[PDB]
Amino acid sequence: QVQLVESGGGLVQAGGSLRLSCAASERTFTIYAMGWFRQAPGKEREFVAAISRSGENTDYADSVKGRFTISRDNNKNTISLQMNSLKPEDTAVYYCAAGRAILVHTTKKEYDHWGQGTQVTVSS
């Protein structure tokens, strides 16, 4: 079983950037496809971005395409979310997620493991 730890959230002004990171358990790191989701006030959780086991393939929600970039470090057992041109509607708890994938280049939308979250608040 895998554990997941998000970091890097905080309070930022609209137009700013933030970089989130997610640490995942070392011994199983590369068995899991990984992703980011977020849950804004009053809303269901929303898929944000996904990355394959290999780190070579990615997928994004239309709401963040071009502003957010997901990356993976298979040296250090992390994934990252670079968030640029932030807007108030990006305010949410951001969750890292993991799920087994048979192939190394597959991205997932459904995940069975997720972190406690990191809070992101974008003010104007």
Residue numbers in the entry: 2 to 125
The article reads:
The point of convergence is the cleavage of the 186 kDa complement component 3 (C3) generating the C3b fragment (178 kDa) which becomes covalently associated with the activator surface. The C3bBb complex is the AP C3 convertase, which catalyzes further C3 cleavage. In contrast, properdin (FP) is a direct positive regulator of the AP and stabilizes the convertase by associating with C3b in the convertase and proconvertase, reviewed. FP oligomerizes prior to secretion, and in plasma it is found in a mass distribution with roughly 25% tetramers, 50% trimers and 25% dimers.
We then fitted the relevant parts of the FPc structure into the electron densities of both C3bBb-SCIN complexes and the structure of hFPNb1 determined at 1.3 Å resolution into the hFPNb1-FPcΔ3-C3bBb-SCIN complex. The epitope of the hFPNb1 nanobody appears be located within residues 267–281 at the end of FP TSR4 located close to TSR5 and the TB domain, and all three complementarity determining regions (CDRs) seem to contribute to the paratope. One proof of the reliability of our convertase-FP structures was obtained when we mutated three residues in the hFPNb1 CDR3 predicted from the hFPNb1-FPcΔ3-C3bBb-SCIN structure to be important for FP recognition. Affinity measurements for the FP-hFPNb1 interaction performed with bio-layer interferometry (BLI) demonstrated that hFPNb1 had been placed in an overall correct position in the electron density at 6.2 Å resolution.
